[PDB]
Amino acid sequence: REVISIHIGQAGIQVGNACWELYCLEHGIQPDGQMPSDKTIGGGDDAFNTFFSETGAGKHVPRCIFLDLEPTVVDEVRTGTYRQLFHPEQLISGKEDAANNFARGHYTIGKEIVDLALDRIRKLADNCTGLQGFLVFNAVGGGTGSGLGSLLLERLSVDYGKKSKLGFTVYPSPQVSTAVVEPYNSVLSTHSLLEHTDVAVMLDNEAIYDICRRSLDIERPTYTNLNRLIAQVISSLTASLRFDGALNVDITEFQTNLVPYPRIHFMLSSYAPIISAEKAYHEQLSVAEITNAAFEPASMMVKCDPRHGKYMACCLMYRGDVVPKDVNASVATIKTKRTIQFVDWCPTGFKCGINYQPPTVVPGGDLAKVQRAVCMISNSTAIGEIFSRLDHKFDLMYAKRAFVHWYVGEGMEEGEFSEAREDLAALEKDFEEVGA
Amino acid sequence: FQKKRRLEQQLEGQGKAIKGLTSAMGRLHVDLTRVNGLIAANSAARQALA
Amino acid sequence: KRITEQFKDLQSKFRHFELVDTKKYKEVWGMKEADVAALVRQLLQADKVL
Amino acid sequence: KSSMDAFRAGQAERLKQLSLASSGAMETLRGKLAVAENVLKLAELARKYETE
Amino acid sequence: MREIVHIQGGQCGNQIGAKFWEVVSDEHGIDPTGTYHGDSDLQLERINVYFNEATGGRYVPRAILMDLEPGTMDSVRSGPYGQIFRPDNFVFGQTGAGNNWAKGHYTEGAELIDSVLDVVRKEAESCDCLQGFQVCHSLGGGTGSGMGTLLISKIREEYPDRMMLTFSVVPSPKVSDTVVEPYNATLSVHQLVENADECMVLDNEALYDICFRTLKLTTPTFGDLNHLISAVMSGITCCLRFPGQLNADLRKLAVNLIPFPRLHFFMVGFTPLTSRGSQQYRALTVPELTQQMWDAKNMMCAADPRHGRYLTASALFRGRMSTKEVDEQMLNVQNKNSSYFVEWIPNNVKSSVCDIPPKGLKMSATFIGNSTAIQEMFKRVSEQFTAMFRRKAFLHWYTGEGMDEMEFTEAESNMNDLVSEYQQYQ
Amino acid sequence: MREIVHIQGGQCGNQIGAKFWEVVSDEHGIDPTGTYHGDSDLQLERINVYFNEATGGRYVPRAILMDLEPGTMDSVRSGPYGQIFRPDNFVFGQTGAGNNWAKGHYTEGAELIDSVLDVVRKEAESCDCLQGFQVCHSLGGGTGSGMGTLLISKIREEYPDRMMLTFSVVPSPKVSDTVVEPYNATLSVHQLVENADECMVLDNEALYDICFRTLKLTTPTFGDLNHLISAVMSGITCCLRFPGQLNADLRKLAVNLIPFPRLHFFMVGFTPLTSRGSQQYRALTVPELTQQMWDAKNMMCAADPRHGRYLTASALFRGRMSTKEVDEQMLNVQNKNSSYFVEWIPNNVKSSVCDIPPKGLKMSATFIGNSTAIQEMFKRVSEQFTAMFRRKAFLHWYTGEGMDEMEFTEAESNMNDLVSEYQQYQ
Amino acid sequence: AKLDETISTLKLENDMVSRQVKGSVEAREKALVDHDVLALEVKRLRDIL
């Protein structure tokens, strides 16, 4: 029972550097692709087969694909600690970067390396037997992760179709702007992904800086800090497929329990408890505490107010010591809570799940090892504010026909600009309609 | 804030009414059982007297 | 055959529900109006004494 | 079945409105009676110190 | 010689049946290895009802095991009392219905019914005189309520004379654990009402409140809910397995509890339930057992049975006792609660006595009441169904794998008419 | 046959009842483990009046604790003989009484008394032929008077054919525990004189004077006071447990004592009460047990009978004695103290003899008088009430919980007319 | 900004508590209907007695 992850671009490969660290660390795999003979942590030999397949005599290789156009970060991870871990062909990279342009990364340069990437993924999938689905991690605000990212989404969809698609994009944040021309490659990829990928769980940057400032006190945090808890939420949502528990939820449960309408699929993720070692034992963790922390707005991967929205559905993974009674009591308290509202046509909306294995702490991190940990993925209508702000800033530059000459010279025209504008407007309209 | 406080007060009023009604239901259920017992006893007495 | 017998059962149930609901509503109104009549009799007695 | 549901709903609504209005009226009447009986009790207690 | 065939479906059904084949195997005194290690002989006399002796002395239960992921097969096999289920019965898919009735009733259930029917047919023909089929299956999933209902219809077709006991643990309104549970419950109850001989409805909010009030368990888990359900399910058949004074089989229960064809949705309870701290303060006397039985909070359904009127009821007492006080108590209960009893039936209660009480205890009792207060459990699920279908929520998932509006509209109509036919006698 | 249920309201009542149950267990010869380890069969002939056979000798008392805190409950469990009560009867809230009549009669009463009635009704229906009720409480607190008195009223309304003994520790002026003792005493006697059937009134002032003069104790903690109150409540009803030469049921005592339905407050004492030192010298025969019985300084009430007149007296002797000796004792006492007695009642003394003396002692006696000098306590408490009711002191803690001035005036008028009824006959 | 954000929270709170009050009203009505049903049953049994 395997799930194949694709990492695209700078953000994809950095989140990969964090995740494929966390998974190997949890399964006890040495950074050389082996497992020590003398000491064996408690687990099932089938547990690690969801990620790290075996190649011959005691050799483990991950099921994944890093791909990028630049050679810089890819040969950096090559030079890094994980040298023999990744198969030398699980690392696909061009020689000239897309340089922050959807058109350049999707037509001119995006039409050479995608064939090799797709061939490699196809052979790896055919090696895999029980492919649960495809998970994508990328940044929508860049060139390498956006253009050929959407190209690969389309090509995977036309190749398999029947296998689930779960994306994890990094939208531009409201105020912190890493790049300048970001909204272009954001909206252009939104036009595609709104109807190609099945379920999208969104991420942000300020929405995580604030968390690691308040609950972690790292006043000067960075991507190396954020990516670790990103890996943590990914692991805490795949834990049910990976390990064994009491109330399992496979990769189909998320889509079956959280996507009412085919064109209403956008998820807000949240993780509790985010706490450092200093407060870990000075505070008393419990199911009620962690659930209330998860459902307060300030502990969300996406900078948005759910109090301007109405929750449509939620999925709660739990790890470690979790009795299926305290979770029920806490979620009943949440339903009774006087702040978060529900859309009138969803009486039951809390898909829970439990796993025995508690979270694993990476050494040198800020998160402390804790008995339990939750992970809340919710389909809610408050996300429409994100796209509304995106359009409200997109038109300001689109009207002036500024920064468009790069795309038009590469070959695309303003017709698809207007198409993306109109379709994201329709998406906002659709959220407004479902809010009824 | 005035509106919120007033709505709260109405909420506790309704809760108190609910609890009182439940207490009355319990009392009436007990009286149901007692009355049915008396029915049975007097039926036996009627047969004996006949 | 299933839907025919279901039709017949539906007709019988319709008649039964009509009779039961009408009888119940009539009886409960009669009982509670007798109760309020007793209460107003008590009020009149109190007023006369005062 | 539509006729079924419509008729039963109508009966339920009429029972609802009857019960609610009747309960309100009884509460008002009981309040009046409680005031009256408090008055009578005060009169009863007061006439104890009255001389013959 | 009267054989019971036990069918377990999905994670929930599989765990419930794991506890069942723990309790009943202990009662007949077999070791976890599979070799008889009892002491008495009455427990050996009726091994056949729940076992098939095989060469080498390893008894094996007659229970079919169906699901769509090995993640439940191994969870129910590795656990205690797991190494006695016959490996040949281990029929399983490896896809996973995923809380969907369609995926488990029209495509993957459709392709697995062939093998599961082969297993059940060889099991039926390997025993001489069938007594009945009893299926312990959830109603909120898609591998227990999607494929289980199809298997139920298939068994009805292949043996249209055998009693059927559907231990169906229906969902809960407040205890929300899935978002399409109203769908996967209504669509299965629609097809269960027509082809089930008797339906024992269960729930988990009731089991939690019992494990709070009576057992006073601080941290009740599924290992306790399923244990209690196993106790009830092993108590339902005392006469077919042990001697007594007034026996009662599944046919007897159906005759004395089913006055109309569609009206066979019972509600179940067990006695005596008492905490370990108070095990030695109270008395196991027939008046106390009956007083506990005839309460409203002692039952295993969220419906408060004190709303409607019991059309009929059955009690199975087990222990050396006195039928005189048995009947006196269970007639005084009618004389004192005649309001909660329908008038046009005299002696609404059927009481039966078995001689041998269960292991550990000394005098046990099981309650199976066919009442009209069970309507309130289906009315809420119908309300949820109407609320969700009024906006066509999650409908694309169902209609993308063969489902049409026909099933949904029929389910709405028949839930409404079933609640109406329960409401009629009130 | 005949039996008595017991209730322990509040902390004072709970501790008094705990000592009472220790005394009764000692007299009947049972261990704190619940088993029987006495010597004779005359005690186990009639233990069903206070105990129930649970399972193989583990006798369980027929009493129910009742308060609003867990500390006292934990104390009684941890104390000796506290491991016998049924854990299903440890009913108790959590918020806190606040020593407030409103907080124990209008909010926590309304939130726990349905449950306390449920458990007491379960016990009263488990027992077959009821004889009465027994309750222990104090008339100076909030949950002592509120909880216990509302329970008294509800039980009187529900079983209005059973004799009722309420043992009330009335406040005494010198031992002034709290500030609202007169308020609580007034609001409690207002309901006792109207609903409950007889209260035995006791007071800490006399309970200390007895210990200082007769017992000659040095440091009497509450253990000795509760011991004396126990030894009184144990001998109040002995004709049930043990045979007697002239039996006397509780109803017989009530009908002989209470001349009019509103003069039912009993002032009680016990004999012999001999100091540990002078006991070895003292002589114990009937014409000195009776002398100490009518000794005005042995009365467990700060109301000297020489300040009033006797309406009726009851002397319950225990041990093998001479009935003619007892009768001549009573006759010559009446002729000696004719002045202290009412003219229009010939032979104001009712005498009873039981055949089994208490543990160790060879002869014993208990005195229960209905003297009209008991009006002193009510007069004093009414004076203390009106000292505060003129200025509405400490009254908002009841006004805010919802009691007017009308019921306060009602209760004070009730006390005044009760004092008038005692004084008029004298 | 602070005032308007607080105002939005207050409005959300007010509408949700109004929904809760309406639910309480419905529950109270249903309890009243059950109540007079039970009273009817009591009166009928009293008449039989």
Ligand SMILES: Nc1nc2c(ncn2[C@@H]2O[C@H](COP(=O)(O)OP(=O)(O)OP(=O)(O)O)[C@@H](O)[C@H]2O)c(=O)[nH]1
């Ligand atoms: N939160 C977070 N964001 C990251 C991280 N790494 C990259 N990003 C995002 O990447 C964006 C920068 O553009 P890129 O995604 O690197 O562009 P690209 O996909 O590499 O394509 P090019 O522009 O041609 O290099 C920033 O806005 C970041 O939000 C990371 O580790 N954490």
Ligand SMILES: Nc1nc2c(ncn2[C@@H]2O[C@H](COP(=O)(O)OP(=O)(O)O)[C@@H](O)[C@H]2O)c(=O)[nH]1
């Ligand atoms: N009482 C009890 N309930 C269970 C158990 N396992 C699961 N459930 C409940 O049964 C409901 C439906 O489970 P289901 O989806 O059918 O599990 P599946 O077989 O994997 O599909 C869930 O809401 C669980 O809460 C169990 O062992 N005992």
Ligand SMILES: Nc1nc2c(ncn2[C@@H]2O[C@H](COP(=O)(O)OP(=O)(O)O)[C@@H](O)[C@H]2O)c(=O)[nH]1
């Ligand atoms: N005889 C006796 N009296 C006690 C004991 N403990 C407390 N008291 C009396 O009980 C009174 C306290 O009243 P309390 O029970 O707290 O009122 P409540 O809280 O409403 O029940 C004090 O005035 C004490 O004199 C005891 O062990 N024995």
Ligand SMILES: [Mg+2]
């Ligand atoms: Mg790039």
